[PDB]
RNA sequence: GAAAGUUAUAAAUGAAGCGGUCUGGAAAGGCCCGCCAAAGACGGUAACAGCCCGGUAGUUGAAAUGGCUUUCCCUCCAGAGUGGAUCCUGAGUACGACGGAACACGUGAAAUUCCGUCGGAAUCCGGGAGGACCAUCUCCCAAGGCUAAAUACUCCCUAGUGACCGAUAGUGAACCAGUACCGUGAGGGAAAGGUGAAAAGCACCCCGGAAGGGGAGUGAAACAGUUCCUGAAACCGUGUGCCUACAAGUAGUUAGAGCCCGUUAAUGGGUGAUAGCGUGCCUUUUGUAGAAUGAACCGGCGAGUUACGAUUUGUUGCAAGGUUAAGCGGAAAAAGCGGAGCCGUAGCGAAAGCGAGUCUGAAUAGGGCGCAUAAGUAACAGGUCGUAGACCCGAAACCAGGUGAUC
RNA sequence: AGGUUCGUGGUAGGAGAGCGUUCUAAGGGCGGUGAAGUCAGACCGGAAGGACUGGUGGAGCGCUUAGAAGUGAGAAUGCCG
């Protein structure tokens, strides 16, 4: 394009609004703030959760639970994704990482059982759900745990 | 595709260019956005004004609060005073921003193909000079009928082209890796050496 | 970049001060009172632009009444007779006939008398 | 500076699978002789933060309760 | 302590139009011809200069002193194994009680470090830590010391840059500025730029004591004459076309005769005897012409902004994927490299955990939250919010360091 | 782009389309045969506003498309003259 006829995409840029420039624009004297309150003052307003003295909602309901230091989370792989592999292939967590369908392993690879598979495959992973194992041996493959 | 020609003006044969680079349908909106992005990151943004807390003086209340007949005043450097401080004004600040990589690659492809779509691109087999001489370069430019702002892309040898063309006004020489959207858009014609074409194609 | 306010304020104020030409005292010299004078003049013109039609209709009716009283008719009777006969001449043209061509006015009054009695 | 998460309400609410907030009932501490068994059974479950309160406390739990 | 090199502090050389013609006070400008260019940066010259001047690119240059780098000189120097009998390995310390402090950690289940007061070890078959503590295991040797680089800042110096200001702006200070002035003192703290290209800064004559004028002269211009480019408004005057001394006036608007003119030429301009209608502007209020508030008039200055996060709408690129951060590279560039990380693709439960389900529950019951019923991510722009003075002006007061008994 | 029908008082407030000012980039321009500024006119547009002619002035300034803001004053017992 020529620099003397630049035209940005329509709808992608808009004009800023300026308040306090005369009464003809609708944002003149009071500048969209009303008349003589706390919210009409410079730097005015109350805290995010303030209710004017009434007890805040979070302070009239109880706390619950604790946090486990040894919490374990697993990367989830479903069966339908696993269909993208030529059968007779030994599927390995390192292979799952190299193909790019698993970005980071959190505490191990655990496969689930939604969707369908139809390929004879051998799969090894840290954990298996019951139905996922049943579906894998249903198609003829074998499951082994790492 | 295009017609390769020698630097003396005589035809040198034929040259073909990759269609994934020079043959795509240009995306104008992406080019405009990238041009704005590249132009907005060239500015220093060195500017500054003094608030009422940096103007020398102040502190003492000019006169009493009540009973004197004058208006209530609190400092000699208040914004409404004559020598007072600025309210908001400018401040040192950066303006640079950068947009996703694939967008920038699409932009360079589109603007580089748009030149070919308008017959504003010249490919020549070689371009060399024994010694730096602006007269020879001017004669060259006259021979290949450019007569306008031009950008010359030389790849590896070039002998001494930058020196022998540094004084001409609307002429710029870049080493085939510094190619940019804004630089290409700034100049009218684009003269590119054959050896630079392979480099440009293989990079993108 | 700094944008100092020159040449724009005076250009705008001088237009109002020129619009207030011919007023008494400072109303044609000083911006603050000239602005109020100009706004009030615009408002007065807007209102009088409606009252003008009312005033002229009153004048036409008075002249028609005066001319018709010389023919042993009221304004009310004359207008009723003209409406009953089927004549659609407005007050302006009847007043014109009354002021100048009174013969034609008397002919129209004869038509109204004919229709009214009938 | 990035805005801070309200720690007091980060111990009481939970973010569900649709983005809503889940809370606990609040009359269940020390006067169980004064309320019936139906009321106690229904107070031991969990409720949801209503629309009016959600409109007021979005910003203050904006990052994962 | 030498030798060599380099660098900093003066400098030298350096291409090309007196080109013709028009306007003009003056050519660097217009028109028509040429030339140089590793030099078309900047400034000056009677208006806008690559070819008039100082210069610029490039190439050279140092008697003297300082800095850096190599080489020589000079100076100083033990490091491997094989054995364990015996000896050594930081004492009023390490810890403990009491009272405080620092650790993101407010005495708490309180580990770790430091201070004041008392008590007070082992020492290789030994000692400490792994967030009270004991056993097992693992890692490590306190109570002695030194150590460059990657990091923070700029009163200064050399070379530069700016979608920074342009005399109420920008430093308080573009000018003999921390000066004049104010105060006992600490301390506070201004106003004030421009003749002309060149003084060619008005010889001489007339009025006057002078100041100041009228001619004459210089000048492109004196209506540029020693606050001197331009010269607005308030404010003060001189002359004249229309009206005005029986008239109750927010001063105008509508109708309108008479008199005087003649335009960006069109159902034009100035003034207006007489008639109808008509209680300024702003703020704050249920309600203001208000006898409620503000403004003597004119001019200049004077109030929603930026940085980082959240959320929502629009646009663009890719799409079950999207995207890099710091950093390397470079011209205060553009690519290229960098996948550490972040969001999304799975939820439920306080948790172990299970998983298109899960939790409650004795339950294959019912119910809650989810799936069926699946589009996100990166950047930009608008709206709003949070942390920062956060929209601008205004207290009485509080604390800390100092100056004052010349009243 | 052309029609039919229904509408077009308005404070706080919501939404939309625009005028003008300073600077930057590209294209194209005018100016000692007189630029910006200033003064006067009975011209043009729906508004903010924009031209043309003449006097003073004596050297710089518009236009088109985008971008960035120290962005427009009649009031604050507002500050300076
Ligand atoms: Mg707008
Ligand atoms: Mg409004
Ligand atoms: Mg107002
Ligand atoms: Mg108010
Ligand atoms: Mg309010
Ligand atoms: Mg201060
Ligand atoms: Mg103070
Ligand atoms: Mg200042
Ligand atoms: Mg400026
Ligand atoms: Mg102003
Ligand atoms: Mg009059
Ligand atoms: Mg959870
Ligand atoms: Mg309990
Ligand atoms: Mg020389
Ligand atoms: Mg020379
Ligand atoms: Mg001449
Ligand atoms: Mg010439
Ligand atoms: Mg000269
Ligand atoms: Mg001149
Ligand atoms: Mg000059
Ligand atoms: Mg030791
Ligand atoms: Mg210890
Ligand atoms: Mg203790
Ligand atoms: Mg041990
Ligand atoms: Mg540890
Ligand atoms: Mg432990
Ligand atoms: Mg040691
Ligand atoms: Mg000035
Ligand atoms: Mg100043
Ligand atoms: Mg003194
Ligand atoms: Mg001078
Ligand atoms: Mg004299
Ligand atoms: Mg004289
Ligand atoms: Mg004379
Ligand atoms: Mg003369
Ligand atoms: Mg001059
Ligand atoms: Mg003067
Ligand atoms: Mg005047
Ligand atoms: Mg009488
Ligand atoms: Mg009389
Ligand atoms: Mg009257
Ligand atoms: Mg009242
Ligand atoms: Mg009164
Ligand atoms: Mg009051
Ligand atoms: Mg008053
Ligand atoms: Mg999208
Ligand atoms: Mg990547
Ligand atoms: Mg269920
Ligand atoms: Mg705000
Ligand atoms: Mg003393
Ligand atoms: Mg309306
Ligand atoms: Mg209506
Ligand atoms: Mg709005
Ligand atoms: Mg001319
Ligand atoms: Mg002439
Ligand atoms: Mg200007
Ligand atoms: Mg003029
Ligand atoms: Mg304009
Ligand atoms: Mg302003
Ligand atoms: Mg004023
Ligand atoms: Mg005053």
JSON list of C-alpha atoms in Angstrom, two decimals, chain A residues 39-136:
[
{"chain": "A", "resi": 39, "resn": "UNK", "atom": "CA", "xyz": [-19.21, 9.24, 44.18]},
{"chain": "A", "resi": 40, "resn": "UNK", "atom": "CA", "xyz": [-19.05, 12.76, 42.69]},
{"chain": "A", "resi": 41, "resn": "UNK", "atom": "CA", "xyz": [-15.77, 13.61, 44.42]},
{"chain": "A", "resi": 42, "resn": "UNK", "atom": "CA", "xyz": [-12.23, 13.30, 43.11]},
{"chain": "A", "resi": 43, "resn": "UNK", "atom": "CA", "xyz": [-10.94, 9.87, 44.02]},
{"chain": "A", "resi": 44, "resn": "UNK", "atom": "CA", "xyz": [-14.28, 9.01, 45.56]},
{"chain": "A", "resi": 45, "resn": "UNK", "atom": "CA", "xyz": [-16.08, 5.72, 45.94]},
{"chain": "A", "resi": 46, "resn": "UNK", "atom": "CA", "xyz": [-15.98, 2.88, 48.43]},
{"chain": "A", "resi": 47, "resn": "UNK", "atom": "CA", "xyz": [-14.10, -0.41, 48.59]},
{"chain": "A", "resi": 48, "resn": "UNK", "atom": "CA", "xyz": [-14.88, -3.25, 46.21]},
{"chain": "A", "resi": 49, "resn": "UNK", "atom": "CA", "xyz": [-17.04, -5.22, 48.64]},
{"chain": "A", "resi": 50, "resn": "UNK", "atom": "CA", "xyz": [-18.32, -2.44, 50.90]},
{"chain": "A", "resi": 51, "resn": "UNK", "atom": "CA", "xyz": [-22.03, -2.35, 51.75]},
{"chain": "A", "resi": 52, "resn": "UNK", "atom": "CA", "xyz": [-22.28, 0.86, 53.78]},
{"chain": "A", "resi": 53, "resn": "UNK", "atom": "CA", "xyz": [-21.83, -0.79, 57.18]},
{"chain": "A", "resi": 54, "resn": "UNK", "atom": "CA", "xyz": [-23.99, -3.86, 56.67]},
{"chain": "A", "resi": 55, "resn": "UNK", "atom": "CA", "xyz": [-21.96, -6.99, 57.25]},
{"chain": "A", "resi": 56, "resn": "UNK", "atom": "CA", "xyz": [-20.29, -8.07, 53.98]},
{"chain": "A", "resi": 57, "resn": "UNK", "atom": "CA", "xyz": [-21.45, -11.30, 52.40]},
{"chain": "A", "resi": 58, "resn": "UNK", "atom": "CA", "xyz": [-18.12, -13.07, 52.86]},
{"chain": "A", "resi": 59, "resn": "UNK", "atom": "CA", "xyz": [-18.13, -12.32, 56.59]},
{"chain": "A", "resi": 60, "resn": "UNK", "atom": "CA", "xyz": [-21.43, -14.09, 57.34]},
{"chain": "A", "resi": 61, "resn": "UNK", "atom": "CA", "xyz": [-20.61, -17.47, 55.75]},
{"chain": "A", "resi": 62, "resn": "UNK", "atom": "CA", "xyz": [-18.00, -19.92, 57.11]},
{"chain": "A", "resi": 63, "resn": "UNK", "atom": "CA", "xyz": [-14.66, -21.04, 55.74]},
{"chain": "A", "resi": 64, "resn": "UNK", "atom": "CA", "xyz": [-14.26, -24.63, 54.62]},
{"chain": "A", "resi": 65, "resn": "UNK", "atom": "CA", "xyz": [-11.52, -27.12, 53.87]},
{"chain": "A", "resi": 66, "resn": "UNK", "atom": "CA", "xyz": [-7.75, -27.30, 53.73]},
{"chain": "A", "resi": 67, "resn": "UNK", "atom": "CA", "xyz": [-5.04, -27.71, 51.10]},
{"chain": "A", "resi": 68, "resn": "UNK", "atom": "CA", "xyz": [-3.11, -30.94, 50.64]},
{"chain": "A", "resi": 69, "resn": "UNK", "atom": "CA", "xyz": [0.63, -30.41, 50.23]},
{"chain": "A", "resi": 70, "resn": "UNK", "atom": "CA", "xyz": [1.00, -33.73, 48.38]},
{"chain": "A", "resi": 71, "resn": "UNK", "atom": "CA", "xyz": [-1.76, -33.04, 45.85]},
{"chain": "A", "resi": 72, "resn": "UNK", "atom": "CA", "xyz": [-1.28, -34.95, 42.60]},
{"chain": "A", "resi": 73, "resn": "UNK", "atom": "CA", "xyz": [-2.70, -33.91, 39.22]},
{"chain": "A", "resi": 74, "resn": "UNK", "atom": "CA", "xyz": [-2.36, -35.94, 36.03]},
{"chain": "A", "resi": 75, "resn": "UNK", "atom": "CA", "xyz": [-2.34, -34.99, 32.37]},
{"chain": "A", "resi": 76, "resn": "UNK", "atom": "CA", "xyz": [-5.55, -36.19, 30.74]},
{"chain": "A", "resi": 77, "resn": "UNK", "atom": "CA", "xyz": [-5.63, -38.03, 27.41]},
{"chain": "A", "resi": 78, "resn": "UNK", "atom": "CA", "xyz": [-8.90, -39.19, 25.87]},
{"chain": "A", "resi": 79, "resn": "UNK", "atom": "CA", "xyz": [-9.53, -42.09, 23.52]},
{"chain": "A", "resi": 80, "resn": "UNK", "atom": "CA", "xyz": [-10.65, -40.10, 20.47]},
{"chain": "A", "resi": 81, "resn": "UNK", "atom": "CA", "xyz": [-7.34, -38.21, 20.34]},
{"chain": "A", "resi": 82, "resn": "UNK", "atom": "CA", "xyz": [-5.56, -41.57, 20.51]},
{"chain": "A", "resi": 83, "resn": "UNK", "atom": "CA", "xyz": [-7.14, -42.61, 17.17]},
{"chain": "A", "resi": 84, "resn": "UNK", "atom": "CA", "xyz": [-4.57, -40.54, 15.23]},
{"chain": "A", "resi": 85, "resn": "UNK", "atom": "CA", "xyz": [-1.94, -43.30, 15.46]},
{"chain": "A", "resi": 86, "resn": "UNK", "atom": "CA", "xyz": [-1.08, -46.07, 13.02]},
{"chain": "A", "resi": 87, "resn": "UNK", "atom": "CA", "xyz": [-1.99, -49.33, 14.73]},
{"chain": "A", "resi": 88, "resn": "UNK", "atom": "CA", "xyz": [0.58, -51.74, 16.09]},
{"chain": "A", "resi": 89, "resn": "UNK", "atom": "CA", "xyz": [2.38, -48.80, 17.70]},
{"chain": "A", "resi": 90, "resn": "UNK", "atom": "CA", "xyz": [3.79, -48.76, 21.23]},
{"chain": "A", "resi": 91, "resn": "UNK", "atom": "CA", "xyz": [2.44, -45.51, 22.66]},
{"chain": "A", "resi": 92, "resn": "UNK", "atom": "CA", "xyz": [4.74, -43.99, 25.29]},
{"chain": "A", "resi": 93, "resn": "UNK", "atom": "CA", "xyz": [4.51, -40.80, 27.37]},
{"chain": "A", "resi": 94, "resn": "UNK", "atom": "CA", "xyz": [7.70, -39.56, 25.71]},
{"chain": "A", "resi": 95, "resn": "UNK", "atom": "CA", "xyz": [6.09, -40.24, 22.34]},
{"chain": "A", "resi": 96, "resn": "UNK", "atom": "CA", "xyz": [2.96, -38.39, 23.50]},
{"chain": "A", "resi": 97, "resn": "UNK", "atom": "CA", "xyz": [5.18, -35.43, 24.36]},
{"chain": "A", "resi": 98, "resn": "UNK", "atom": "CA", "xyz": [7.11, -35.53, 21.08]},
{"chain": "A", "resi": 99, "resn": "UNK", "atom": "CA", "xyz": [3.97, -35.65, 18.94]},
{"chain": "A", "resi": 100, "resn": "UNK", "atom": "CA", "xyz": [2.83, -32.46, 20.68]},
{"chain": "A", "resi": 101, "resn": "UNK", "atom": "CA", "xyz": [-0.56, -33.52, 22.08]},
{"chain": "A", "resi": 102, "resn": "UNK", "atom": "CA", "xyz": [0.77, -33.29, 25.65]},
{"chain": "A", "resi": 103, "resn": "UNK", "atom": "CA", "xyz": [2.51, -30.02, 26.48]},
{"chain": "A", "resi": 104, "resn": "UNK", "atom": "CA", "xyz": [3.60, -30.67, 30.07]},
{"chain": "A", "resi": 105, "resn": "UNK", "atom": "CA", "xyz": [3.22, -33.74, 32.25]},
{"chain": "A", "resi": 106, "resn": "UNK", "atom": "CA", "xyz": [2.03, -32.74, 35.71]},
{"chain": "A", "resi": 107, "resn": "UNK", "atom": "CA", "xyz": [2.44, -35.93, 37.75]},
{"chain": "A", "resi": 108, "resn": "UNK", "atom": "CA", "xyz": [1.99, -38.61, 35.08]},
{"chain": "A", "resi": 109, "resn": "UNK", "atom": "CA", "xyz": [-0.26, -39.49, 32.15]},
{"chain": "A", "resi": 110, "resn": "UNK", "atom": "CA", "xyz": [-3.74, -40.85, 32.86]},
{"chain": "A", "resi": 111, "resn": "UNK", "atom": "CA", "xyz": [-6.03, -41.82, 29.99]},
{"chain": "A", "resi": 112, "resn": "UNK", "atom": "CA", "xyz": [-9.83, -41.56, 30.10]},
{"chain": "A", "resi": 113, "resn": "UNK", "atom": "CA", "xyz": [-12.63, -43.34, 28.25]},
{"chain": "A", "resi": 114, "resn": "UNK", "atom": "CA", "xyz": [-14.82, -40.94, 26.30]},
{"chain": "A", "resi": 115, "resn": "UNK", "atom": "CA", "xyz": [-14.94, -41.32, 22.56]},
{"chain": "A", "resi": 116, "resn": "UNK", "atom": "CA", "xyz": [-14.14, -44.47, 20.62]},
{"chain": "A", "resi": 117, "resn": "UNK", "atom": "CA", "xyz": [-11.10, -46.31, 19.28]},
{"chain": "A", "resi": 118, "resn": "UNK", "atom": "CA", "xyz": [-10.78, -49.01, 16.65]},
{"chain": "A", "resi": 119, "resn": "UNK", "atom": "CA", "xyz": [-7.03, -49.68, 16.36]},
{"chain": "A", "resi": 120, "resn": "UNK", "atom": "CA", "xyz": [-4.86, -52.45, 17.80]},
{"chain": "A", "resi": 121, "resn": "UNK", "atom": "CA", "xyz": [-2.42, -50.47, 19.94]},
{"chain": "A", "resi": 122, "resn": "UNK", "atom": "CA", "xyz": [-0.17, -51.06, 22.94]},
{"chain": "A", "resi": 123, "resn": "UNK", "atom": "CA", "xyz": [-0.33, -48.18, 25.42]},
{"chain": "A", "resi": 124, "resn": "UNK", "atom": "CA", "xyz": [1.72, -47.55, 28.55]},
{"chain": "A", "resi": 125, "resn": "UNK", "atom": "CA", "xyz": [0.92, -44.74, 30.98]},
{"chain": "A", "resi": 126, "resn": "UNK", "atom": "CA", "xyz": [1.10, -43.95, 34.68]},
{"chain": "A", "resi": 127, "resn": "UNK", "atom": "CA", "xyz": [-2.59, -44.58, 35.39]},
{"chain": "A", "resi": 128, "resn": "UNK", "atom": "CA", "xyz": [-5.62, -46.00, 33.59]},
{"chain": "A", "resi": 129, "resn": "UNK", "atom": "CA", "xyz": [-9.30, -45.62, 34.26]},
{"chain": "A", "resi": 130, "resn": "UNK", "atom": "CA", "xyz": [-11.29, -48.85, 34.38]},
{"chain": "A", "resi": 131, "resn": "UNK", "atom": "CA", "xyz": [-13.45, -48.14, 31.33]},
{"chain": "A", "resi": 132, "resn": "UNK", "atom": "CA", "xyz": [-10.43, -46.96, 29.32]},
{"chain": "A", "resi": 133, "resn": "UNK", "atom": "CA", "xyz": [-8.71, -50.28, 29.98]},
{"chain": "A", "resi": 134, "resn": "UNK", "atom": "CA", "xyz": [-11.88, -52.16, 29.05]},
{"chain": "A", "resi": 135, "resn": "UNK", "atom": "CA", "xyz": [-12.15, -50.24, 25.78]},
{"chain": "A", "resi": 136, "resn": "UNK", "atom": "CA", "xyz": [-8.48, -50.81, 24.91]}
]
